[PDB]
Each structure stands twice: as C-alpha cells, then as structure tokens.
Amino acid sequence: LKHFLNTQDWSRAELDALLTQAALFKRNKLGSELKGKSIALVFFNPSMRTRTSFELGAFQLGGHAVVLQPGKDAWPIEFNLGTVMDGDTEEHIAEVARVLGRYVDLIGVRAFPKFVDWSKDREDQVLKSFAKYSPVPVINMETITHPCQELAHALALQEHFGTPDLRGKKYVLTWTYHPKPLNTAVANSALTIATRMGMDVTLLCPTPDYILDERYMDWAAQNVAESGGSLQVSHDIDSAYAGADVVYAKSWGALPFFGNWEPEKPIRDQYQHFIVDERKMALTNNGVFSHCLPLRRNVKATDAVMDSPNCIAIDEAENRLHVQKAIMAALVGQ
Amino acid sequence: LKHFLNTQDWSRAELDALLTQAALFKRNKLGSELKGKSIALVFFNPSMRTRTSFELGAFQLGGHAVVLQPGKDAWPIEFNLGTVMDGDTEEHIAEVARVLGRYVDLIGVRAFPKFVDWSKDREDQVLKSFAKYSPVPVINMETITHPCQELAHALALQEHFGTPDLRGKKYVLTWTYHPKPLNTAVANSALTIATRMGMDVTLLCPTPDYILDERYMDWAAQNVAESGGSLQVSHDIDSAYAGADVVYAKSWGALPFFGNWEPEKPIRDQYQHFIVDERKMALTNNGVFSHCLPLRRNVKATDAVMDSPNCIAIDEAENRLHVQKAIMAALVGQ
Amino acid sequence: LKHFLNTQDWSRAELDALLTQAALFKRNKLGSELKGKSIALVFFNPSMRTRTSFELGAFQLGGHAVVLQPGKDAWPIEFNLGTVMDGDTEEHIAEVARVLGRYVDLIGVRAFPKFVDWSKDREDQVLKSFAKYSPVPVINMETITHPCQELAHALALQEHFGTPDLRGKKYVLTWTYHPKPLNTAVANSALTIATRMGMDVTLLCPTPDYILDERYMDWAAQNVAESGGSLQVSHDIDSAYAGADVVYAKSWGALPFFGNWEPEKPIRDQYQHFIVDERKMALTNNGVFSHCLPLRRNVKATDAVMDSPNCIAIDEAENRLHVQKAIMAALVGQ
Ligand SMILES: CC(=O)N[C@@H](CCCNC(N)=O)C(=O)O
Ligand SMILES: CC(=O)N[C@@H](CCCNC(N)=O)C(=O)O
Numbered sequence A, B, C: 001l002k003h004f005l006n007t008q009d010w011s012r013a014e015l016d017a018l019l020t021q022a023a024l025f026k027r028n029k030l031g032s033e034l035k036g037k038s039i040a041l042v043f044f045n046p047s048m049r050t051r052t053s054f055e056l057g058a059f060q061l062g063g064h065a066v067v068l069q070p071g072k073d074a075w076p077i078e079f080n081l082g083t084v085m086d087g088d089t090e091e092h093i094a095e096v097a098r099v100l101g102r103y104v105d106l107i108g109v110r111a112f113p114k115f116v117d118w119s120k121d122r123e124d125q126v127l128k129s130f131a132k133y134s135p136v137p138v139i140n141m142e143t144i145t146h147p148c149q150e151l152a153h154a155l156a157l158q159e160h161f162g163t164p165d166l167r168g169k170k171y172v173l174t175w176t177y178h179p180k181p182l183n184t185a186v187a188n189s190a191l192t193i194a195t196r197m198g199m200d201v202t203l204l205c206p207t208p209d210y211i212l213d214e215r216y217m218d219w220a221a222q223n224v225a226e227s228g229g230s231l232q233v234s235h236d237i238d239s240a241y242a243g244a245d246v247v248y249a250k251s252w253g254a255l256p257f258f259g260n261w262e263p264e265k266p267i268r269d270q271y272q273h274f275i276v277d278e279r280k281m282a283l284t285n286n287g288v289f290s291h292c293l294p295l296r297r298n299v300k301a302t303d304a305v306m307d308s309p310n311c312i313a314i315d316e317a318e319n320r321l322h323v324q325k326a327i328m329a330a331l332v333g334q
C-alpha cells in the first residue's frame, strides 16, 4: 500500500510525475479521478487552507470529503499499544483506522506535535499509526513534515522560473520571528524539497540551537549528494541573502527547548530583526519570497515585502489545491 | 466587481430581477447555474438557517459550499492595516481574501458587531475588507445589515398579497423584548427594504433612544421620496398597529448604550409588553406577522401569534434559500 | 408520515425489507435514490461513525447531508411547550423543525440523555418533538434507543451465519465496565432486535440494579412470544457465556442511580472483571463478539478479543453505512 507521508519516501520520478499532474489539473480543474470516491480529512488541529483546498479538490474530481475533528465532533483517539484505556481517550486508532477504511477511499491526517517533548513528537506516532492500521492510502496534511506544502512550493518555484529544473538557483530557508515557538514541520519540509530539487540551500537561523533535527539535516545531505546542489547553515543575515534566488521564511521553536519554552522566549525576542523586509530582499538576485501562511504581517515579513511583485505566497497557497488533487489521484485506483 | 453587500447598492430593477429569479428557483429548484463552482461560507458567529440554506443552495445548483469558522476551525483574522501582528490574530484579511479567491468563486461572510463600540461596529470593517481584498464576489450573510433577509422577507410579502407591488400597504416595523440587547442589523434591513418597496412604514419603538442609526433612517427617507411610500417613527403601540397590513418584529439594543449595557438593561425590561400578541395583531387590517428567527416564544411573540395563519415566518425562512440562490447566480459568470 | 424512530414501530416484514435493501446497497453502493435530495443531520452530542456514514450515504445516493450541531454552530433549542423563553434557549423546536422541513427531505437526530433524571430522559422528548413538528421523515441517530445500530448489528450477524434466520442461536447481551456511567440506548436496542429476531437472549449484568428499563424488557417479552426465541436475565458470567453463539457487550449506568452517580461509581468498579476476554469467549460455542464502538481496549474488551477472527465489530460498523442508506431510501418518495 502506497501512502503520501513524505516526499522523501517517493522517487524523484514519482515526484516529478505528481508535479506534472498538478500542473495539468491547474489547466483543467474538473475531472472524474475521484468519481464516487471519498476522503476523510482528520484534523487534530486548526486549518483554513488545508480543509478548504482538500474539500474543494475532492469536489472538483467528482468525490466527497468528510471533515472530522477528534475531540471536537469525533471522539478522542488513543495511539499507544497495550495500555488500559481508562483515561480520556474513548477508542483506539486500530478501530478508528479500520472503520474509516470501510467508509472512505483515502484518509488525510493533520496532527501537530504536543510541544511537551520532541523525543515523542519526532516519532510521528499519529501519522504512522494511521498508515499502519488503515486499509486505504493515508495523506500527511501536516504533522512534523508538510509534504503537500513542499509540492505546492516547488510547483510555484517552477512556474516562477519557467522551468522544472531549479538546479543552480540559490535557495535561502530563513527563520523568522513569532511571539511563540512553532512547529518545525514546514522548515523540515522546505529543507527536504529544496535539496531534493538540487538547489544551493542555505539554512539561515539565529543560533546553532535553531538548527533542524538531524533527521532532516541528513535527508538534505543525501538529497544534495544525489541532486547536485548544496547545503549550508548560516547565522549571518546579509551573507545568506546575498545573491539569493529564493527566500522562504518560517518560524519555529528551538528543538533543544521543547517542553521548556520559558527560557527560550527571551532568546527568540532578541532576534525579532530576522523579519524579512525590503532591506534584506534587496540583497538578493531579484529573488522571490514566500511563506506557507498564515503569516503575521510586520512580524514575520513586512507589508512591503508581502505586497511586492516578488512575493509568490498567494500562488503557492493556490497550488496546494492542484498538488493535493494530483496526490489523491495517484493514490486511488478503483 | 459586483458584490451583494446591501440592497441599497443595487438599482430597483436589479432587485426586482433578483426577486423574480428567486420566484423562478422556487418553482424549479435544481439547476446548473453553479455547476462545478464553489462558495466559501465564512461564519464569525452562530447560524442554522443561513449555513443550511446557502449550503443546500450551492448543492442544488451543482456547486459546493465550504463552511469555515475562524477562531473555531480556521485561523483568527486581522483587519486593521499596518499594525504589528503580535497579538491574537494569526493572519491578515489581505492574505485570507486573496487565497480564498484562488479557491472559490464566491465568498459569503457573517460577522456580528462586537457590541463594545458602535462607532467601530457601524464601519462594517469585516465585510468591507472582504469586498476590498477579494478577487471574487462577496455576499453579506449578516453583519450590520441583513440584505439576504430583506429579499426573503420581501418575496414572502409579495407572495402573501399576490403581487410584486406593495405600494399602499401599511408596514409596521416594531421593536420587541429580549433579555439581552441585540444587533440592529435585521431592523436596519427591514426599514431599508420596506421603504425601497414603497410601503407606508412606521418604526415603532419604546423611546427615541431605540431609533436606528441615522445612516438607515436616511436611506429610508431617500427610499420613500423615490418610492412613493412614507416613513414615520412612533412610540405608541395601538396607534402604530392600527390598520397595519404587515407587522415585522425585531429586538435590538439602544445604540446610545453600546459598550455600556449595564444601564440599558433596566430600560428594556420596562417595555416587555411590546411583545406581539393577539391583542395588538387584532388592531391591524387582518395583517400578516413575521420575524427573522430565531424567536423566543412568549417573549418576542406569543404562541398564539406564532401559530396564527397570519404568521408567515416559516415562509420567509424558506425564502432565504430561493433568494440566496438568485443572488449567487447573479454574481457568478464563468 | 412514516419515521424511523425505533425498529419496534416497524413490522417484521418492513425490517426484513430494510435489511435486504441494505444488503443490496452493500453490493452496489452508488445510486440515485436520493438524487437532488438532502438530509439535515442534527447532532446534540459527539459522533465520528454516525456523521461519516450518513454523510457518505447521502453522497453515494446522489443527495447531500448538512451537518448541524446546536449550541455549537446552530442555535440552542427549546422543547418544552408554553414556557416563557427567557432562558438560554433561543428558538423553539416548533420553528426549527418546520423551517428545516422547508429545506431538507429528511432529518436525522442524535441526542443523548442529560443523565440528571431518567424520568425525563426516558420520555425521548427531543426525538418525539422532531417527529411531531417535522413535515418530513425523522431518523433516530441515537437517543435512548439506537435503531440504526440494531440493523447494522443484525445484518452483520446474518452475514456471519450466512442466513437471515437467526432463530435458535444463543445471544448474550453482556454489560461491561467503563470508568463512567453511560447511556443504555445501545443495550436497549440490542435487547430489542435480538428478541425481534427470535434468538435465545440472555441479559447478563452484575446486579438487578443494572437491568434495563421495563419498557424494553417488555418489548423483548412481546418480541419473544411472537418470534419463538426466549428472554432471560443473568448475573453469573460463566453460565451466560456457556454455549453462546453471539456475545454483544455494552456498558451503561444503573438507571436507579440516575442523577446520583456518586454512589454507583464504587458499585461498577467492583465488577471491572465483566471485561470480555479470551477466557469468557472460550466458554461460547465458537461465538462471535461485537461492540457498537467506540470501545476502550483492555477495559470493555481485551486486545486479544478485539483482534480475534471472531470479532465482527468492524463489519458491524461498516454496515451502519448500508443500513442507513436503506432507511433513507425507504423514507423518501418524491
Ligand atoms: C502558526 C502555526 O501554528 N502555523 C503552522 C502551519 C499552519 C498551516 N499552514 C499551511 N500552509 O498549511 C506551523 O506549522 O507553524
Ligand atoms: C438572537 C440573535 O443574536 N439573532 C441575530 C440574528 C440571527 C440570524 N437570523 C437569520 N434569520 O439569519 C440578530 O441579528 O439579532
């Protein structure tokens, strides 16, 4: 059974095929690839774009999305094995995935880390459990990685430069400020796809404490060696932005401070200057800027940057619809 | 770009065309006017009829509605310009409207005032912001006016009297009791459409403190002068109801007490006799009664009035479906 | 007007016809029985399977389900007659049912008891009120009985034994532990359908305090006398399980302790051994086991029992989809 948990699990040929189908769907949006089929969108956290794009995607392909929010409308789920379920959880994922598998053709899952302990969050328990027990394909709608965002992002870049081959371009993945520590998911994903695409990637962040989990630094390394691009970690803003072709911003809390954010708060506040403004963007090679959204203006990026013709954030957001339809079409087959 | 923010922005010919299309949809409910199209229903407040009628309307015309509730499932939105988004809001309407505009063909918005300060609530910031940033038509699902209710109401009246021309009929818009101060939206709308339709309108309320915002009193005046009807404010129940052809009730808090309801509470409680009962209705010319719903029985209207053959509230509620389908059909064109 | 409030209101012929149509829908899932039609799914409590199965059912038959949650997205409803609505409730069921009746073709309702006083909960006020005021068929999605579960359960049993005639089989409806007192709905329903099907039923529970409401004990008696099966109450585990063909577990709070659960808590805790394990199941005649779900593993049933080839819980859960489509098809006719 083939799932869409991470682009890293797919071959370059398969990913290129997904991106091409995405481009095709963008030209002809209505289809019958999901005629009479259905997808269960399981959200453990908030969403606007994700719920909307998947729901519309299913509709445009003749299918139907059922939106579920455990703990909200659906019942809370247990993932640990062998435990005595006498707590808050009402049913086990083993039953949840099997039942849904009798109803729907696809299951999408969004579940952010709990932020109590990265040791457990990095295990991707919810996602892996769905994939394990589900008799139908599972799609990652964002957990500790955000593969759908990777392809929406990649497609937007290919559309911007007018070519699928992004090798040679200087890609800057920069950390940005936010009054709170966030998931590293989008950052992990950006690093993964930018390298897989063979670009010269620079992970710009304040201190070594903000470097991403080794798992992804390693995927990136393997990606570079096989793509022809390069990987580099930087802590100097100006040297990073210099001659960049793409600037992708994202904020996240330092992994070393998981479950103990009290002390990291004063640490992030000292770098609220990492904000992407006209000044920094002026250092790039007429580079494009984007963010996965939602974005806090004048905090992560300035109004001027967000409104510049170089900002492709809206295009990337739109592409979520097309890339997800490509993913759902690829996973079904009945 | 044409939106449906208020009936006052539309010409009488356009409104008559909407009402006629509504009547046509009521005769033939299934159609293809929205085939493959979609509408994003953004609810900032509660709804049963509105969400249901729009959702079914989209379905019956071959389209699909995506229901969104910011702060609930979607992310909280910022509307003020240039501010440093370091508060509760996660993203700006500029991004929200632009992204939705890449997904859907129409955007409906429901956002009640905050009731903290009428000076800001009367600016209709949420609605206006959607219309400003959205690349697709925006529909008012109730903010400080309720235009969809106006047309549902108007159609019901035309169906009751068996004619589109309501000129000559005596229309009584009466305030009614409610343990809490409410939005003036429906009242503002009732006054607007009743005058636009050329009826002899009487705004019956307890004291001059319950008179509606000048904006609407003025729209009404302009409407009367151009329709041939009349406008009058009254504080005497019996003189108002006398010879009335239509009685539309609605409760609302005194604008002069916005943000300071503590003292107005004892004021409204002294007029809990404004309730629409058989006695008052017996003073009318075999007049019809209606309320926009939801209605608290034995508080706003008595069980006897609600169950009388003269009450057309259920018909008006039904018409919300037909009028909204007419509105969505008029706004799309692709 | 025909509703689906309880299987007990239907003749055996009608129920057999429903089960047969369910079997037919399971073979050919897509149809046009609900083409252009719609159902309003009103949930006063949580749901995953129910909302999903009904929503998908409507979709597969060419219709559309509108999901509503009063107090959540829709407005809170009043059911008592003649009262002065100056409390929390915003509108009366009389208006709610009539309005929905102008929009949809079917109305499903899920409303659990309040657990404050069984005298009032057993009156089934919400369900009965919808049926009373609705101009369209009403479907019980679980209140104090769970008829849709009965048919899903019955069909699964018929599929297991390869025959619609379950007469002769030994059926054991056993109480099971749960850290909290639950609704007796599923138990009441299991007892009702097992007897209606003519099986030899044994109501196994800890003490006479856990015996179900007389209403259902009596339905069961009437059912046995007319079906050829039998009814028996037991408090001894081993004697009950012995030679059983079917074991259906469900936990519920003692009716005599409604509104006063403080003292029953220590009572249930003394019987946490009623858990369905391999030991008890080994006492049966190669019997099948099932639960309505959601189920707390190692509390209501052991992991070994839930994973045994004899557990048909997933099949029963799947059947909810097919039986409900049969029910909706039977109730519509336009
Ligand atoms: C602010 C916050 O928690 N953001 C989330 C992402 C929101 C979803 N975005 C998307 N494009 O799908 C984060 O990962 O930090
Ligand atoms: C009680 C309350 O807040 N009511 C709202 C209206 C509810 C929506 N009605 C409708 N018909 O769309 C009010 O404007 O006072």
Ligand SMILES: CC(=O)N[C@@H](CCCNC(N)=O)C(=O)O
Pocket: A090, C049, C050, C142, C149, C182, C183, C184, C185, C186, C292, C293, C294
């Ligand atoms: C735990 C709890 O409250 N359960 C509910 C039932 C949940 C719905 N199940 C179903 N199969 O439709 C009960 O009746 O006890």
